């Protein structure tokens, strides 16, 4: 119906935390595609916000460069694993979650007690493994922000992994129209279509 249309020409879920999408937008007047592409790329790479863990609190740790008996990974490895958890939320503020489990076993991202406004993207993300039945209680802090940043966690808030666009001549120079393609890679916290709309 509309003279100028957009559509998703390809959608792909390569993994649980890596989504792909390609979109088309034609026909555009000459010079419009470049403006849209550059502004959309900068918005996708810089203006889209995400949620991640920013602070984890332990109880019986001298420093983040120490070990725990019964847990294979040290405190530093646990913090690194916690930094890789992908969350999704539409709200702002410093929400807090809780990890309260007893071993032995595997501590995955589905073991986090989240507030109702926060969701887990990948349930299978690894945090730590318990070899014996030791108590483990970790208090987490979650907020929504842009860009990047009790032990502080270096949180990277950008959920768009990469972006690309291309401009192609539509055809005969009646009005020298153009075709715009946009490629978006996200971490699963939001789909490429959601990233396009949010941008």
């Amino acid at each position: 119906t509309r003279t100028l249309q957009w559509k998703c020409v390809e959608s792909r879920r390569d993994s649980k935390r890596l989504y792909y999408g390609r979109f088309i937008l034609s026909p555009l007047m000459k010079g419009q595609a470049d403006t849209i592409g550059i502004a959309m790329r900068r918005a996708l790479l810089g203006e889209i916000e995400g949620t991640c863990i920013t602070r984890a609190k332990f109880e019986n740790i001298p420093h983040d460069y120490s070990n725990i008996v019964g847990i294979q990974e040290s405190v530093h490895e646990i913090l690194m694993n916690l930094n890789e958890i992908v969350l999704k939320s539409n709200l702002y503020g410093t929400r807090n979650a809780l990890i309260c489990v007893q071993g032995p076993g595997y501590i995955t991202a589905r073991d986090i007690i989240l507030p109702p406004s926060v969701e887990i993207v990948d349930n299978t993300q690894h945090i730590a493994t318990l070899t014996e039945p030791i108590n483990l209680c970790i208090g987490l802090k979650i907020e929504r922000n842009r860009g990047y940043s009790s032990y502080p966690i270096d949180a990277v808030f950008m959920p768009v992994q990469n972006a690309n666009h291309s401009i192609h001549s539509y055809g005969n120079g009646n009005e020298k129209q153009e075709i715009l393609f946009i490629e978006i890679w996200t971490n699963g916290s939001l789909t490429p279509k959601e990233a396009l709309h949010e941008a």
């Binding site: 119906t1 509309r2 502004a39």
Partner: peptide, 17 residues
Amino acid sequence: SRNLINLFIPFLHVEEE
């Protein structure tokens, strides 16, 4: 400003079912 906004309105367009 108006031209930029008009350039980015169509990405929010939906179609009748």
